[PDB]
Amino acid sequence: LAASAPRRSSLGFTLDLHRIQRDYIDLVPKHWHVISLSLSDGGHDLCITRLQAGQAPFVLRLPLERAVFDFHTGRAELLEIIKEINRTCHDSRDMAAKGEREKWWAEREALDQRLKELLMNIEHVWLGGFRGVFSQHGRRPELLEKFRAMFEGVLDKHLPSRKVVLDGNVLELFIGLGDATKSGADFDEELTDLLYFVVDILQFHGERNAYDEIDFDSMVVETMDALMAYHAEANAAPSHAHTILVLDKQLHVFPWESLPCLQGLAVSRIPSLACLRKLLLDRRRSSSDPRSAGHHAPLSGGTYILNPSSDLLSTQKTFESLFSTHLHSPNSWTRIISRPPTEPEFLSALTHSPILLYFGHGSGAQYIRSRNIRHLDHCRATVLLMGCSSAALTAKGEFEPSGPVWNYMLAGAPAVVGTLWDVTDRDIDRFAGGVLEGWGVLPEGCMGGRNGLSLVQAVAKARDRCRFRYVTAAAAVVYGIPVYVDVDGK
Amino acid sequence: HSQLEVLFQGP
């Protein structure tokens, strides 16, 4: 029976995992996968669990220091960067008054590069050759069985062996490294990382092999050629994949979606499997197909709240006419502009509108008490909180059960888009316009026919529109499940 | 259900 880890498989744990698979994961659309990230009690290991309907669960425990840049150090650098980013947002008006807009811009460019580098280093050091656990590639058993035969050959040739069989999930890590036939592709370090893993799994399960007696570099070359064979065949004969992250309390502050290996891919977060299951069982079908897996929100009857505190003039200017022309006039949207929404107005929008667009400061919590979002029979609205730190993490970067996002999720909002830290009006508006175009709320070309990406796909693509991919766009995240706009729906 | 607790946070 196939080994997947360098440690004892505990029967109670495996039973629990199989019960979770049966009662939660087997309801999840098969083209979606669920990945949990947490730290070991020690803090030394990143624990990754990958779950998908019709697939065996995969549990990974990655020691961050297996090769200084430990978790404490990475998180500290992230929080310092965020603090400096937030400060550039608050000092915008001030710097402009001092005639120093250029130095201000340069500071933001420098922070953008610093955050990019941190994410590069996380992917390189922490994930290393395991980054493929995040791969959205379609599984192809026939191709995998070929790769298995070639890879088992590599082991026979270079190990002694001169017995333990690997789970397919371990082999999928190799496949998940990416297209090996790409010009300039170099997986040597990654492959080394995974070959150590395989030797360790073997060692633990009774097939011992000394590191110094293995020619890893020869194993790397042959494995890469095997992956080139795999990907050559996969590319020759060519999904709506979505990833859903479940994150431990201290890991929401990390912009996972902006790691090199997740950039541009459709990724959302969910607070718990319980929240996931609730949202799935509440899904609305399209008025009229992998898209049938999502929640379908009618375009008609939304609410927008634009510049509620009146000081976001640039934002009002950017969207007011577009929203009038495309939403309020033909699609029966409720318009609240340059005045605060009342709490009853806000609640009524959550209850009755399929889509709520909030273009104001923060999460809007200044306008609606948390406890009344919990009294709601149902939060019908998919909610876009296009504002500074609208996810409302604590000063220490923690995601709390009392925060707005948890409250919306518990109330049943199909999705909530928000920001992990402070962002400028101009640059988050670029992102927001991108979301609305890609999602199909606005026509293509508005911001410069009609697209129909899921909200999650639209968020991932709209990151491209920001001047700063990291200082701005990486703040943006979506909690919930894929939502599609139903243009003719009611 | 210790490494699985991350899946069952909150209420």
Phi and psi angles of residue A137, each rounded to the nearest 5 degrees, phi first: -55, 145
* Identity of the residue in B4, B10, B11 whose CB atom sits nearest the CB atom of A20: B4
Q: Within 13 Å and on the Cβ side, how many CA atoms surround A112?
A: 15
CATH of A283-486, one of 3.40.190, 1.10.3470, 3.40.50, 2.170.120: 3.40.50
Instruction: Give me the sheet containing A303-306, strands edge to edge.
Output: A58-63, A45-51, A32-39, A242-247, A267-269, A476-480, A415-419, A382-385, A355-359, A303-306, A334-337
Distance CA A254, CA A87 (A): 18
Q: At what angle do helices A313-323 and A425-439 cross, to 10 degrees?
A: 20
How far lies A108's CA from each of A88, A429, A472, in Å?
7, 17, 10
CB A234 within 8 A of CB A143: yes
Collect all residues of chain B within an 8 Å Cβ-Cβ radius of residue A13: 1, 3-4
> Which residue does chain A place closest to B2, by CA atoms?
A13
A216's enclosing H/E stretch is helix A216-236
* Cα–Cα distance for residue pair A355/A484, rounded to 1 Å: 11
Q: How many CA atoms lie within 13 A of A28 on its CB side?
A: 30
Does residue A356 sit in helix, strand or coil?
Answer: strand
First to last CA, chain A: 52
Question: Both ends of chain B: CA-CA distance in Å?
Answer: 16
Closest to A447 (Cα-Cα) out of A311, A295, A360, A323: A323
Helix/strand/coil for A359? strand
Known catalytic residue at A446: no
Q: Return the SS3 of A34.
A: strand
Provide CB contacts within 8 A for A337, sequence distance 6+.
A306, A307, A316, A320
How long a stretch of residues is chain A? 490
Would you call B11 exposed, middle or buried from its count of C-beta atoms within 10 A (0-12, 13-18, 19+)? exposed
Which two three-digit tokens encode residue A82?
Answer: 């965020």
> A295 has which bridge partners?
A483
Domain boundaries, chain A: 73-126, 137-238, 283-486
DSSP A401: T
DSSP state of A285: P
Q: How many residues does chain B have?
A: 11
Strands A382-385 and A415-419: parallel
How far apart are alpha carbons A129 and A139 in whole angstroms?
Answer: 19
Measured distance CA(A3)–CA(A312) in Å, rounded: 57
Catalytic residue among A275, A388, A446, A466: A388
**Distance separating alpha carbons of residues A199 and A211, to the nearest angstrom:** 8
In DSSP terms, which residues pair with A331 in a beta bridge? none
| List of residues 6+ apart from A380 with CB closer than 8 A | A350, A351, A352, A353, A354, A412
DSSP assignment letter at A397:
-
Tell if the CB–CB gap between A13 and B3 is shorter than 8 Å. yes
Residue type, A351: T
Strand partners, A49: A36, A59
Q: Show the DSSP H helices in A363-454 as ranges.
A: 370-374, 404-411, 425-439
Distances (CA, A) of A200 to A47, A70, A208, A455, B10: 17, 22, 9, 41, 36
The token pair at A99 is: 């005639």
| Phi and psi at residue A405, to the nearest 5° | -65, -45
Q: Which of A7, A272, A402, A410 to mutate to test the interface with B (most CBs of B within 10 A)?
A: A272
Residues paired with A104 in a beta bridge: none
Return the closest-CA partner of residue A378 out of A355, A352, A399. Answer: A352
d(CA A230, CA A143): 6
How far apart are alpha carbons A129 and A14 in whole angstroms?
25
A39 strand-pairing partners: A46
Q: Are A381 and A394 in contact (CB under 8 A)?
A: no
Helix (H/G/I), strand (E/B), else coil: A129: helix
Q: Where are the alpha helices (DSSP H) in A91-211?
A: 92-97, 101-121, 141-158, 168-175, 188-204
**CA–CA separation, A131 and A151 (whole Å):** 19
Compute the distance between CA of residue A221 and CA of residue A202 in angstroms, rounded to an integer: 20
| Contact between residue A461 and residue A264 where contact means Cβ atoms under 8 Å apart | yes
Task: Provide CB contacts within 8 A for A414, sequence distance 6+.
Answer: A279, A282, A283, A295, A297, A382, A480, A481, A483
Q: How far, rounded to the nearest angstrom, does the alpha carbon of residue A436 sit from its chain's CA centroid?
A: 18
Residue of A406, A435, A397 whose CA lies nearest to A266: A435
- Determine how β-strand A45-51 pairs with β-strand A32-39: antiparallel
Q: Tell me which DSSP letter residue A126 carries.
A: I
Q: How deeply is A210 buried, as exposed, middle or buried, from its count of CB atoms within 10 A (0-12, 13-18, 19+)?
A: exposed
- Would the CB atoms of B10 and A47 count as touching at under 8 Å? no
Beta pairing class for A415-419 and A476-480 = antiparallel
CA distance A112 to A117: 9
Alpha-carbon distances, residue A462 vs A104, A180, A263, A421, A457 (angstroms): 24, 28, 11, 17, 9
A61 beta partners: A47
A248: nearest CA partner in chain B: B6
3-class SS of residue A335: strand
Cα separations in angstroms, A364 against A104, A215, A383: 28, 59, 11
Structure tokens at A419: 């920001």
Q: Exposed, middle or buried: residue A139 (CB in 10 Å: 0-12, 13-18, 19+)?
A: middle
Local structure of residue A282 (DSSP, 8 states) = T
Backbone angles phi, psi at A462, to 5 degrees: -70, -15
The residue in chain A having the minimum alpha-carbon distance to the alpha carbon of residue B8 is A272
